[PDB]
Design an enzyme around this catalytic site. Sequence first.
Site, mmCIF file in Angstrom:
data_model
loop_
_atom_site.group_PDB
_atom_site.id
_atom_site.type_symbol
_atom_site.label_atom_id
_atom_site.label_comp_id
_atom_site.label_asym_id
_atom_site.label_seq_id
_atom_site.Cartn_x
_atom_site.Cartn_y
_atom_site.Cartn_z
ATOM 1 N N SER A 27 0.868 -1.173 0.000
ATOM 2 C CA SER A 27 0.000 0.000 0.000
ATOM 3 C C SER A 27 0.903 1.221 0.000
ATOM 4 O O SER A 27 1.606 1.468 0.984
ATOM 5 C CB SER A 27 -0.926 0.001 1.205
ATOM 6 N N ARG A 28 0.892 1.984 -1.094
ATOM 7 C CA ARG A 28 1.808 3.115 -1.195
ATOM 8 C C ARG A 28 1.560 4.134 -0.094
ATOM 9 O O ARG A 28 2.510 4.706 0.452
ATOM 10 C CB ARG A 28 1.687 3.786 -2.558
ATOM 11 N N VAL A 29 0.296 4.389 0.243
ATOM 12 C CA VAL A 29 0.011 5.393 1.265
ATOM 13 C C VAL A 29 0.646 4.983 2.586
ATOM 14 O O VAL A 29 1.301 5.791 3.257
ATOM 15 C CB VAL A 29 -1.505 5.619 1.400
ATOM 16 N N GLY A 30 0.485 3.723 2.971
ATOM 17 C CA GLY A 30 1.153 3.203 4.147
ATOM 18 C C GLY A 30 0.922 4.037 5.389
ATOM 19 O O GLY A 30 -0.184 4.068 5.935
#
Lengths: 128, 55, 47
Positions: free
Chosen positions: A117-120
């Site tokens: 998940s890029r947002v993380g």
Amino acid sequence: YFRDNGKHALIIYDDLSKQAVAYRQMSLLLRRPPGREAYPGDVFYLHSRLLERAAKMNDAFGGGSLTALPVIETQAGDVSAYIPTNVISITDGQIFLETELFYKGIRPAINVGLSVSRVGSAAQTRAM
Amino acid sequence: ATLKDITRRLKSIKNIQKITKSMKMVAAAKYARAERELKPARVYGVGSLALYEKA
Amino acid sequence: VRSSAGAVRDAGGAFGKREQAEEERYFRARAKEQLAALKKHHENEIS
């Protein structure tokens, strides 16, 4: 409509691997030349123009948002296939479900090793 | 599986076979040496046990 | 079709994970031993 009117929406395409097949049938019956695996050339576009509408408007444009959770179906875990790779390179995150984990007792089978998940950090409550 | 899956699996098994052949050769050499050294130790140990089976 | 070095861990089958674990356990053990020695040296070199 919701995201443009300050509200929040969640959309779940289920599956996109069948929209791809329907598009291929349409394109082949219009006589447009086939491509790889018989899918038309514009099969990435088909999805990229669709998943790019899941935005997060700033507060000047209402502040509304539209999350998307496309569902793809691989063949025997061959994530390397055509539509899976297209949509993987289109989307932000991924949630890999594996049958070896499903039968080993781990349900949901989410393969936390590969799931990303890029947002993380962002988009997570402070306690979590 | 796909072609790349099969290729990777085939390469891995080939490496494994090479390694096991080498280890068989090493074990055979060590075995020959062990038998050579076992004969005298065989007589020595049997002698050392002699007493208890005689008395 | 040939074979190349470092292919057992490229396939990622059972032997790949088995080898990865056989390496990781050993080097965790050695890291623990080396950290203990490092602590001992730290204490013995304060003076």
